[PDB]
């Protein structure tokens, strides 16, 4: 029984590393895409308050 | 007496019939399917260790 527990979990853990690998990659992708989408905005949002201080002034 | 030595010659025989030609595969054959465990204990704890 705990031969084939063994055998099974074995491979579930194979699966598990298979597919954390990937999860890790593509949560580290996602974290770094949200920054650089955050970074954008913000220079976005700058770059429309220096129109508005253009204009305004 | 005399049926003792002949059956104990006849054992001797089959004694070594199985040792050459039976017991080689069989012990083996426990053998392979060790080895296939101990290796498959192995693959178990390399994926533990991934």
């Known amino acids: ?57 | 007496m005399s049926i003792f030595i002949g059956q104990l010659i006849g054992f001797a025989v089959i004694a070594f019939i199985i040792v050459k030609w039976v017991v080689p595969p069989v012990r083996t054959l426990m053998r392979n399917q060790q080895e296939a465990v101990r290796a498959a204990l192995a693959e178990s704890a390399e994926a533990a260790k991934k």
């Open chain 1, 1 to 57: 029984a705990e031969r084939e527990a063994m055998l099974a979990k074995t491979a579930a853990d194979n699966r598990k590393s298979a597919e954390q690998v990937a999860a890790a990659q593509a949560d580290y992708e996602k974290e770094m895409a949200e920054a650089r989408a955050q970074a954008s905005a913000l220079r976005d949002e700058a770059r429309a308050a220096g129109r508005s201080v253009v204009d305004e002034k």
